[PDB]
Symmetry: D2
Subunit: 191 residues, 4 copies
């Protein structure tokens, strides 16, 4: 019943993706969905230098993850890993891990890429962390709406080597599906 | 409600593990559990030459996987992958994949190792295949009963470089937990 | 100096990719390259029924992998893993493992998919087995533009060369795809010479 | 010839491991080794409150990684990933990536855990980023017994050297663990010389 869409975005691609995930999740009667971001780690100075898109979403604390029934994580792909910002935030969940707060909760991952390559590694290396927390891992498989560079691991979008490309209509429907699919799963379990 | 413990074992370590998984799963009111093995791929001649332990369990077909609500896969670790026997069997599930038979079903993995190393890679590379089938992936986290070389990814046992070592009492309780944990999850969903 | 291109192919895509790899490798003077295949596992009646492709390259034995300075492994992606044929074959390298026969030799991997998903996992999950053998792992990263024999080749495949078969299987490797394969072969054969030489 | 041991450590385990690696590397004549650390990310008031360990090695910049023939990366396992400190640092190598600055250089990885789970994933998920940089990846496999400077060292860590901190963090690297670390350094410094030389 409570679903968190937790994301990191520097140039907006994941932020756009996270809105679509939230929309899908919101289609499920039962699901109370909220979107939050992980803190930006770079000082506003270095962020604006690199051309970053200022993020508006409320900043989540590591501790509040425990309140949710499902968490849908969004990260850009950073050389086949989650972002340093998402990795920093997850590194502050050691107290929750020790308590077993996240144990058995639903987890699912979405990503974005630029030139190309690494999106599958980003998603599956994120799963690893969720597994240490004892979270149930939800891939999208081949549903979805309905597939280019898609993966069964989770919704993705291509930004281009430029970062100019915006998520396509089909990438958004996949992202919506993902939110809706895990939300229904969370309601089935929570309900 | 229907739970399959599907395993490959050459020298018995996984077979022993699979019995423990099945026992745990059988503790859940709701769960109809059955143990089956994947076919041995090597001709009986090469099997007996290598010192193999003849497996008794009924041989599963690739097609019957669809009948189950949760599938718990057991494989030895073979240089950080599932065994060639398990990989061969899973390669015959292309018709099910195309049909989406396994989609959204529960999947969970247990393993064994010898000298040491690779068990985490075995489990997480198996997850990959389950994700392509659209299966919900269930790691054990840090429950379990209650941990040596344990992993949150799934139950494991150490056989030694000799292969003489038998699963410990604690490795069996972890394996039982895993069966019981996913079985309760399958009943929660199926019920 | 001795470079083995070792592959598995059901429908011929990896085969074509393997030939590309070997052609690239042959560009390196003092690199002696051979292309071999792992045994088909399914009975030939079932394989031909499946429309499987019959192939010319010699069937490799596990023991002979000891004989090479570099091995470039080719496998179709099978649900984000190597094929069962390749996995069965590598499951027979236990004796090589015990003796350290493959230790410190160069390894590199290329693959093929129907529709793209899982290629990255196939390659990295193959690297794992190579690391158990203590092989040195050669990713292709995003190489210098001008090292590719076909101009405007795009990045997006850092783990190794890949190709798209189509959901159909009817698609064959593009010159862009085969150029990256050729590059991979030339790059690792160059390294094997620099090392062995 | 130039070998960088680049590490992150909160409580000193990777630091000790890094020194072991560098000691092993120094055995290779013509290998010039430096040990540096990635910047700590948490404010020093919070870091000291946490009982974090203050360290002597110089803080590395992303740009200077271009300057080395081999980089041996050290990170504690953090839920089966590298640390956020290491991930933040590598997230700043985008310019090096664009220029191909790290292309074809040797890379290798070592780690540390509290209770063992996830060490394998930390290393292989670090290899991914190195492959994006087109670095050649050096696993340690299960090396020849007699190459280790401490006798009855056991296999079971093919991806790279690891150590156990205890659930407590109070455990320090055993001589058995540090021997494998030393070996890793000596092995990759040997390769870097053979390549660079
Ligand atoms: C250091 C860093 C690493 C990157 N690694 C990759 C990569 O591995 N593959 C890729 O296609 N794009 C890569 N990119 C591009 C980002 O994935 C792309 O800009 C991102 O998906 C944009 O998402 P965002 O708008 O939400 O920030 C990288 C960018 C940076 C800054
Ligand atoms: C080819 C092959 C590969 C192996 N790879 C590993 C390995 O990566 N790590 C390990 O600890 N043991 C390895 N071993 C040992 C097996 O994992 C061990 O014997 C197995 O867990 C026994 O399970 P079983 O009795 O169910 O066959 C390997 C054995 C073979 C035959
Ligand atoms: C059981 C099996 C699993 C497969 N899994 C995938 C998949 O993970 N992703 C994908 O794009 N294609 C998948 N395919 C398509 C194959 O990758 C395709 O047949 C292969 O690349 C053809 O190469 P080849 O002609 O050398 O055999 C699968 C095919 C089979 C037989
Ligand atoms: C947020 C975080 C996540 C951790 N995850 C794991 C884990 O995945 N497995 C494990 O055995 N230890 C884990 N630990 C323990 C660390 O691996 C341990 O603190 C580290 O190895 C110490 O090395 P260092 O002194 O160089 O920092 C974690 C610690 C923290 C801070």
């Amino acid at each position: 019943a409570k679903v968190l869409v937790l994301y990191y975005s520097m140039y907006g691609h994941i932020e756009t993706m996270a809105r679509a995930v939230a929309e899908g999740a919101s289609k499920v009667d039962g699901a109370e969905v909220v979107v939050k971001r992980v803190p930006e780690t770079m000082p506003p100075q270095l962020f604006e230098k690199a051309g970053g898109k200022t993020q508006t979403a409320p900043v989540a604390t590591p501790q509040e993850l425990a309140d949710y029934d499902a968490i849908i994580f969004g990260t850009p792909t950073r050389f086949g890993n989650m972002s340093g910002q998402m990795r920093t935030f997850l590194d502050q969940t050691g107290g929750l891990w020790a308590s077993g707060a996240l144990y058995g909760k639903l987890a699912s991952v979405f990503s974005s890429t630029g030139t190309g390559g690494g999106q599958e590694q980003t998603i599956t290396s994120t799963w690893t962390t969720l597994a240490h927390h004892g979270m149930v891992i939800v891939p999208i498989g081949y549903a979805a709406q309905e597939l280019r560079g898609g993966t069964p691991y989770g919704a993705t979008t291509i930004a281009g080597g430029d970062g100019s490309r915006q998520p396509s209509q089909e990438e958004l429907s996949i992202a919506r599906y993902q939110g809706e699919y895990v939300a229904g799963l969370a309601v089935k379990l929570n309900g």
